[PDB]
Write a protein that binds this ligand. Structure first.
Ligand SMILES: *[C@@H]1O[C@H](CO)[C@@H](O)[C@H](O)[C@H]1NC(C)=O
Length: 446
């Protein structure tokens, strides 16, 4: 059957829209009136107070500060944790710091603040609302959908995915921030976010552990041209893991009646926010798997460069070469979350075989790093060891490195190579010395 809502078309309840394993209930999405989608426009000139725009009343747009010669980015919410109500506008403000943009925050709280399955179905109508506004801008004002970027978090990722399908995949870009798993993962492409929804789709996965039994609200399934899995995509540094327990009560979670640490689910947008100002701190390395990446493979950046996770992912050369490209990287646990990966190779030197740990610190014109463990076990002179480390600072031009070992024997590194990921640049350092344990050995350019 289907309910029709005027200019937003009809909404069917048969397969695959409803009556499926992931969504058995055959109810219909609420009316546009009951969802009350609100398009709140903010621009560099009006960053504090919004200008409500309506596709059905074109004058709201004509009289607004919407600039036809600027890109447009829609930001759509989903799960809203206590105190995070203002994350959409916060995101717009960060964008304002680096670009001129029409930032439209999509508020559909009346439609989302209800039982989960209902909210999930309501995404269809919010998606139709977005598609219609984009269609008005395009057909009536000559503003191409190519200038439009739809950012959707949680349930909002499927809202934007629906908008894209309606636009026949012509919207410029869609960014899915930890797309909601319950009621979407495993279903046909027509009912969820997928690569065909936009000319370019990038996804950040941050809470991809199964909702049952792990309480991971995000999708593990790949749904973009680029699918980023920072820190593995299931557990983020700095976030308390959720207690492994009985079905969820996916609705109790959604509606705040059940305990749930939303930290991992929200990290997706937290990383996006930071990537706006610090994209160089989020270089992503395409790789067949996270374990492979963690085993020091898929480094340095490939010939096409590394896609920068977040805001600047659209700059990636191979962004649409294929779909479901897995991209990995690790982040910090707080603040900017930025990291700079370096492949460190150490060739040991000395007269005695020892047992212990070897560490290396990097020194550059931008500053120096802390010491990082490269290897632990038997330390044999002339043996070479390699480890890719995620440093919390960009040292810039590496001018020297320091070697340190621990558990009056002496040990040293005759040569250490440090390769930066961005361009594969190898810096070599050399020394003919050896030091006692817990003493820093400096190695200079060679
Ligand atoms: C964090 O990012 C901001 C904005 O780009 C920058 O000004 C600040 O220096 C960064 N802090 C660190 C520790 O990198």
């Amino acid at each position: 059957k289907e309910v029709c809502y005027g200019h937003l078309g009809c909404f069917s309840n048969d397969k695959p829209w409803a009556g499926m394993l992931q969504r058995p209930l055959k109810i219909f999405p609420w009316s546009p009136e009951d969802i009350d989608t609100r398009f709140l426009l903010y621009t560099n000139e009006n960053p504090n107070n919004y200008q409500k725009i309506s596709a059905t009343e074109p004058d709201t747009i004509k009289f607004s500060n919407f600039q036809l010669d600027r890109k447009t980015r829609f930001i759509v919410h989903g799960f809203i944790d206590k105190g995070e109500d203002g994350w959409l506008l916060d995101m717009c403000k960060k964008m304002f710091q680096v670009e001129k943009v029409n930032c439209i925050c999509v508020d559909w709280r009346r439609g989302s603040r209800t039982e989960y399955t209902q909210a999930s179905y309501n995404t269809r109508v919010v998606g139709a609302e977005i598609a219609f506004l984009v269609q008005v801008l395009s057909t009536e004002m000559g503003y191409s959908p190519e200038n439009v970027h739809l950012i959707g978090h949680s349930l909002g990722a499927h809202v934007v995915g629906e908008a894209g399908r309606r636009l026949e995949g012509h919207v410029g870009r869609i960014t899915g921030l930890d797309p909601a798993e319950p009621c979407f993962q495993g279903l046909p492409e027509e009912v969820r976010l997928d690569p065909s929804d936009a000319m370019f789709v990038d996804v950040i996965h941050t809470d991809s552990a199964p909702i049952i039994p792990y309480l991971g609200f995000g999708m593990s399934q790949k749904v973009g041209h680029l699918d980023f899995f920072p820190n593995g995509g299931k557990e983020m540094p700095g976030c308390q893991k959720n207690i492994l327990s009985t079905i969820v009560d996916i609705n109790g979670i959604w509606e705040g009646t059940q305990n749930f640490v939303a930290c991992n689910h929200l990290r997706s947008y937290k990383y996006y926010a930071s990537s706006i100002l610090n994209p160089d701190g989020f270089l992503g390395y395409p790789c067949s798997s996270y374990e492979k990446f963690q085993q020091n493979d898929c480094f340095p950046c490939p010939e096409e460069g590394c896609p920068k996770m977040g805001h600047y992912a659209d700059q990636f050369e191979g962004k649409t070469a294929t779909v479901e490209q897995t991209v990995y990287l690790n982040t910090g646990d707080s603040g900017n979350f930025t990291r700079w990966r370096y492949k460190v190779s150490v060739t040991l030197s000395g007269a005695k075989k020892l047992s212990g740990y070897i560490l290396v610190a990097l020194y550059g014109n931008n500053g120096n790093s802390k010491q990082y463990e490269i290897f632990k076990g038997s330390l044999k002179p002339e043996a070479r060891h390699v480890r890719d480390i995620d440093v919390d600072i960009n040292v810039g031009e590496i001018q020297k490195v320091k070697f340190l070992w621990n558990n009056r024997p002496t040990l040293g590194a005759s040569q250490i190579t440090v390769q930066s990921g961005v361009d594969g640049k190898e810096y070599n350092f050399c020394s003919s010395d050896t030091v006692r344990e817990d003493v820093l050995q400096s190695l200079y350019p060679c």
